Assembly symmetry: C4
């Protein structure tokens, strides 16, 4: 009795990512790559998912929602779940609590008008926080997050109020020689993010980022994702194995192929169940309450 819950979470960065994270603000050429993600990328992923009768979760920035209305329709009509992901993919930590709350508000209503239901799930743009737990909870609806990394392949409840001492070399060592102090567990369930299961850093060329990659090969990345599944399957009876992808990157033919190899491999395993993130949270909320 092995139950491995595997899922694809699709972050639709498209133009919003270049506006909010990736330095493409003033680059007609980058913005053009954003338009590819929405207009050409979204449909290719939907083709991929349908070919394998797969469900999925789309974390769609408001901007992407209002900029690719025809593709948004295509996603809702497939029965896929829609989660929040900012408006212009702004890093939550560079905003005021007001700015960040106005963005969260705006995203909620965008997704409600589009789908009928309010979104249950959230992904922080570029994967930041600050006091997002507070708002995801305050801002109702939000049942789970997929931005944090306290864990690997098991969900968990997010503690709010963790604290730590930064180093200050203008002071004496005892002033900062203190441990991190864990806060208190909340009801926000975390389906963890993982840099090792994210297609974008390794495979998207970002000219303005000193840390850019983009020419790591789909085959080395494909193999690494499989390696992680193999271990997890071997060492766990209950695990959730979620993959973060973007149409910006994963709708490119060479990585489209990569996913076909990943999907076919996973489907050779028994106990595997493809789901959406909301179904992972629901199951976890039942699997162990409090």
């Amino acid at each position: 009795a092995k139950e491995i819950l595997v899922a694809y979470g699709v972050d639709i960065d498209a133009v919003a990512g270049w506006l909010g994270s990736y330095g493409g603000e003033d680059s007609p050429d980058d913005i053009s790559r954003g338009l590819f993600a929405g207009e050409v990328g979204i449909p290719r992923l939907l083709k991929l998912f349908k070919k394998y009768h797969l469900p999925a979760t789309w974390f769609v920035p408001g901007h992407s929602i209002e900029t690719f209305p025809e593709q948004m329709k295509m996603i809702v009509d497939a029965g896929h779940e829609v989660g929040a992901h900012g408006y212009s993919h702004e890093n939550p930590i560079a905003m005021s609590t007001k700015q960040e709350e106005d963005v969260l508000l705006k995203s909620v209503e965008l997704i409600k008008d589009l789908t009928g239901k309010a979104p249950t799930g959230y992904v922080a743009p570029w994967w930041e926080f600050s006091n997002i737990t507070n708002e995801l909870l305050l801002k109702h609806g939000f049942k789970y997050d997929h931005s944090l990394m306290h864990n690997d392949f098991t969900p968990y409840y997010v503690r709010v109020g963790d604290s730590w001492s930064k180093i200050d070399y203008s002071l004496e060592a005892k002033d900062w020689m203190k441990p991190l102090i864990r806060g208190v567990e909340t009801n926000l369930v975390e389906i963890p993010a993982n840099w090792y299961l994210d297609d974008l850093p390794p495979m998207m060329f970002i000219k303005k980022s000193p840390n850019s990659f983009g020419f790591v090969s789909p085959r080395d990345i494909g193999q690494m994702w499989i390696d992680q599944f193999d271990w997890v399957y071997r060492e766990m009876d209950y695990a959730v194995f979620s993959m973060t992808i973007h149409p910006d990157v994963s709708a490119r033919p060479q990585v489209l192929l990569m996913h076909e190899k990943i999907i076919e491999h996973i489907n050779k395993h028994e106990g595997v169940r493809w789901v959406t993130f909301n179904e992972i949270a629901d199951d976890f909320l039942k699997r162990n309450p409090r």
Copy 2:
């Protein structure tokens, strides 16, 4: 009835690239690499193309035209198409509309005196824009561009006048929470650029660029280009598959070899037709007008 139009577009960066893009301005050693591209690199590619009875398009910067006159003759005499690519490979977006127009003017007359005909095609240096659509059209001749990335393996007509709201954290979220607004379709046909089909970023060492690579292997890159062909061939009946290369990089023995494997692989496929970019634009203009 599968028609896959595949083409090699050769950007002759040589010395111009180091002067305009790659930080080699004050580096005798870099400039020396530029002289290799023109004097030794150009002939090696011509040898490659002739061995496989391949046509090709060369996007030659003015500077390269006036600096390698003997090699320019070798290219014209092979019957290859010549497109524009700046003078000293200056990024269009750092120029005034006047500077950029004087460069365009100068390039046009350089290519006309060299070939007899004015150039029909253009590639923006390092792949920028600004209001280049306007000028490529205004500046007559220009029938197509190969700098933008709204699409993959299908050409398209370039809309001018797209607009978007940048993020300003000095303002309130509603001030920038707006979609991108598409402009209006022009007659400039785009045969799209693609970082995943460009030899330079992965394989040229650029000391002054924090984002430099240069030691990614021709074999991982070769494989990635093939992977893209394989998918495109499998999933499309009409597609254009163009590769951007530079004598600076692709005339190096280890990547010369890489292309022989790529070319031999493509030639095993039926429906494949090697062409020049101008022939791709002509066919597209007919394949679907307006």
Copy 3:
């Protein structure tokens, strides 16, 4: 009669690394990755070591000691050696001699209260010095270091007092055209660090570091470690082959697997003896005194 002493040295950077070296100070998301290292990472490595009845040395920052008390207990109870590694993983060279001495003091007493014995070994955070030899010696206990790189696969005694002339282009060449002047041999034994046998640089994504990697594949790294063993085994009769790893990186399923291949390979060789660093120093102190 071949004696190859091979060891795993585990640097528990966890949260301390993000606080002291890796720029994660103000990143809830990074700090969350630090918590993974301690809470989830430490136990996984212990599982790995136990599966192969391997001993090991853990270089635990004070911060990690006071932040993961339950996991610290799990390590001591396995019989593994505990060495120093700062408090908040602060780079020794950015501290005053007082700051650096207070950190050393504090680490010593932390490790003594936890284990009963004072630590014999030390690893400089991020691998710096300054006048650490002086203090490792002064601060008693410290019998060996694993931060320096004068050598490969043979330990040695650390000279204190080496000097060299820096270049100053405001002066005349003869002012800095002088050799490095070796100081005098101390009793501090060095079991050498090696970037080619460190899991973190190649495989941890560090957003704030221009020099970040993180998407190099475990299989290419695995192969490189093996390659080094193979040569050493082939060319030496007495050598010490130590690997630096972090729960932050090596407790990730894809590199967990990498180690199983490394361990199984090494165990196919005769003359190989798995030990702790303290046992390597003891043996070396006897193997050749002075």
Copy 4:
């Protein structure tokens, strides 16, 4: 009748490289890696060369000469050629003509006192120029250089006096829209440098360099060097194939192995002749004068 002249040029950066190029000035830990290059690195390469009865050329910085006197003796006694490479590996282009001349003077006399003869060959540290042609010639002895990149696998005579127009966006396009103007051929013969045949950039980790690599695998690099040999052998009857290496990197067991594969491969080819750089210049001076 195929004559392929292949050679190993060893740049002994050791401590000088960290002092002059690689940012290791204030890093005891880096300097320690420099000491490895000289003390442990030099002998390992000599072992490599002797195993295959190979000749070689060592470009030794003055600093390295005066810092590793025992290893210098080992090199001279093997019959290997010694060329110049600065004192503290200072980039020629950051110096005054006086500073650069004093360094050249000092290097000449260092190498003369050590070997008896003055050096015939030179490599610019980190591969710069400025008006080095003038001095290599003026400063007598110097018959050849191995810093420039006008060509691949054929030597050539260095033109002095090349000029080009830099871009200035404060001016009008016509002010810089001019070609490069070739100067006049000198007698300095160039045995060309090549980033694609240099072990250091891909495989040495340099913390202070944003462009650092260091975890590219010896096997991908090994294969790339071989690929270049294979093409050159296939396409040329007379070529010189020289490899630039450093004890800092190539004396590391995993790349030591890489070279054994490279050497064994080259030795399977007929027409191949292992030589020193001086022998390559002598042959070229005769092969075609003027």
